[model samples]
Target chain A: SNAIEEVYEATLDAIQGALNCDRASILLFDEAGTMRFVAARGLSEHYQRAVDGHSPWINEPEPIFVENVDDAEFSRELKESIVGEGIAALGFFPLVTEGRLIGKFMTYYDRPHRFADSEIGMALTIARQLGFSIQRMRAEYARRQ
Target chain B: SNAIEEVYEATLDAIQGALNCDRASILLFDEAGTMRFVAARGLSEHYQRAVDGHSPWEPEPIFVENVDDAEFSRELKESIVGEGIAALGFFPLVTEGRLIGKFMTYYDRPHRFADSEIGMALTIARQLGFSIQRMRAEYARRQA
Candidate 1:
């Protein structure tokens, strides 16, 4: 529906505005809780390879910074190789809807930097926006089926 | 029981400090969806009508800009009008984790409020949100 599509566009705009970052991606977890990339910006092929089949629970305290593959325990060698190529900090914001953890919004920064309190708050809001949108879409789908 | 009592006290202190309102109250909804006056401060006998047996679904939205502008019937107005209450604000702190009753707060007067006041109210609502989940669990256990 138009409402759901509008919400998605609004979410992308909000994520970009709130994080003030070069790129953002929304990832959804499958029924089995495996993460898959859904949408993104400024991503390299190498970074995309690392994200495939990534599971936050398996890699506890998921890496949030750009580092060599040897230095970071979570990313693929390709991701490590791409570090310092305008990719600095990466943070994940989980999207939870109606008490179920649905997915996450991942942000990529240009420099190695710490996320400020305001940035975290913005990320949380973005997650909430996506959660609401996803919930609405699911409800609409259910109604249609 | 201790934790519940502690939450009540914390809520009182928080309301007083954050809003500077003369009175605050926390009302709980039972399984039958009846509002019970669980706690209160700086209230007069007349205030009982507003606090007791109040139903969220039945009443006009509690957070009104003006009391006189309230859409409820005259009988409700006569029952709930507080002394010198220029304006009032009510926030329903709903439990998000499960389907259950609400945690609500009432503020007196038409005082201009700040962002901190709104933030404090939201925090209290969040606490009540969790409490509602716990309350539901306890209620379920009693039934079983």
Candidate 2:
């Protein structure tokens, strides 16, 4: 249905406004379980490739919020790559449907940000919508095939 | 079992735990479109008295970022803000595309929702919808 496309477009724009971030994207996993960029704003191919397969939640659908790229938890190389790309903080929210971890969506801030609890709650809400939306799209495609 | 009361109560308290907000509730529209609160937590009586049974428009995931945003109805702004609510989000609990009811998250001040929050709320809504459907079916079969 056209409604599905409507949500995908609306989700991107809404997320930009809601999170007030410079960049955001939804990535999906391939058959080989490698992450690929699906929809994005302000993300470059080089940038996307550098951190693409960085998924940590293969079995669990929990979220990750990094306050600063230079934080102790981040690897030096990953931090340098992200910081060089002009992002100071990141939030990776997992998308799971029916207990299956599919992929994730991300928010990249231009400045170091202390992610708040309310914001985390909001991110999960968006991921929930995207998960349903993405799964619906896949179901429709499978039906057609 | 037909004991939907516990499910309803559990949702309210469970949502509170997840949201860490001051209030949470589940409201359903009966066959006649009557919006009634099945469960609530930390909500002021003044607010409920003002809202009970007064149904409002369609849903897309309602987010009132700030009570004073000027988009909220004057009455809603006054009633809820007066009752100590500053922000809120409402997610519909649907089952297989059928609208059943809704659960809400509230904050004491203006807040921005990140993807994480949205995902968790949707997860809760899905689980709650399925539980309600499962319980009702089991309850009916037992009665039969």
Candidate 3:
């Protein structure tokens, strides 16, 4: 329902505000397990499309923090999109429910940034709440159907 | 997961505290559209089984403020063993305005329905209804 969409928006706002990032986005796995952007702020459509399915974990739940994009390795195509989007650093907070990876929220920084312990803790808390909310909303949708 | 159960427990607590009811139960239609008790408090297993699928509303919601003044068939009367119950209220649990299930409130002595109680009941139903639907969808998605 639209209520879940609202939650996604609010979560993005929370991530941007708390993480001190220039942009934030929420993506969830569709029926086929492809992660698609559901909500975003301060991100362009072109940038989103360029890195749509790009991820750090192919089989995991740990958070991925890219403190410096230059020091990290990525595809030539992905590196171009990341630099072109003015993303010097980034972080991926996994959304988990029932001990399964459903999706993730991303933080984009225009400058190299180090994620603090407090920030990581806060990010995990938000991700946990968002995960449960998504689960609850999905359950409600199925019942309605 | 168990979040749905937490919602149910919170909802029952809200109904009990807000409506001042002695007993309450939540029932939902299964995949076969048969109503079954999903949660309850202050109701016996025997009573739940005895009146499990009984409902006053075919699809719409209904409330009998005073069961003592109401009429029932002899067979049903014998089947239902709601001890000292004199009043009851039924609130439909609807999501997206679709009738999905219902929750019941039982009063020990004859009680008159109030406007405040009705409003609170609907509000509780609104939250519980949405939570149930979300849970169902997650379950289906996982299975598929």
Candidate 4:
């Protein structure tokens, strides 16, 4: 019925507020399996494009936890963007709905940070909520059609 | 065909070897949607039972770098410390676009997963998926 984009943004904001992060984003795999930023904050479109479909796991969506971007083993360009963006830590919680590896929700930090158990719990909760919401929205769309 | 447990253990081994993690596991669902541990390494049941908070409120993969500072809490951190677990990773075990279960990797200490390693996880999952499907079909064919 709606873009479903707003829902994702609101959820992203809720995560950022709860954990006090630099930026939060929800990246979705379009029909073709291209992982791109759908709803995001604290980064611009240019930044998102620069890192599109960029993650470790391809076949299955696994959690990507970077204790320090400086120590990250990604590409040089990735490291540069992260450093330039002033980001320190990153956590990617995969968004799976009805068993599909649909997308992921990301947490970006401005400083070297260790995620506490409570914070991880909050992110998991939000990711789950977002997943269910996405599924429901997709179902609604299918029903309408 | 090998026993199901045999295949599961093999899958766990593959994940650990490829990802270079100390532990790995396969957690699947029941009809009620409750997730249960099937196979694992490095994570003992004593610790796992305590760590078994619950699952399936949402069937997504959960990964954490530092249990101490993760969004989960102090008790959870304490629990991780109790088991001496510093980091962990998880991925959904899917079939034909449906989430049937999840696989995981456990680190003895805090660890970072590189792009290539993370990609390996997906690679193993895909391998496991294909193997699992063939196993199931074979199991069915044999029974018939």
List iRMS for all predictions: 15.4, 12.1, 11.5, 17.0
- In the range B2-32, model 2's lDDT, one tens digit per residue, is 3356456655644654556788888887888
Task: State in Å the error of residue B49, model 1.
Answer: 25
lDDT of 2 by residue, A18-49 (tens): 56778998888888879888778887878888
- The TM-score each candidate achieves on chain A is 0.76, 0.88, 0.93, 0.91
For model 4, what is the error of residue A53's alpha carbon versus the real structure, in angstroms, after optimal superposition? 1.8
Better of 1 and 4 by lDDT: 4
Best by lDDT: 3
* Candidate lDDT (C-alpha), each: 0.56, 0.71, 0.72, 0.69
DockQ order of candidates, top first: 2, 1, 3, 4
TM-score of each: 0.47, 0.52, 0.51, 0.49
Off by over 4 Å in 4: A59-61, B1-144
For each of the candidates, give the backbone clash count. Answer: 0, 21, 12, 20
Off by over 4 Å in 2: A1-6, B1-144
lDDT of 3 by residue, A1-145 (tens): 2445545654664565456778888888888768889888888989988888765666556998888888888888888899998889988989876778889988888899999876675566566656766666566667766
TM-score of 1: 0.47
Compare candidates 3 and 4 on TM-score and give the better one. 3
Residue ranges of candidate 1 with Cα displaced over 4 Å: A1-6, A58-72, A75-85, B1-144
RMSD of 4: 16.2
Considering only chain B, report the TM-score of each candidate against the true chain B: 0.72, 0.88, 0.86, 0.84
Error (Å) of candidate 1 at residue A93 is 0.5
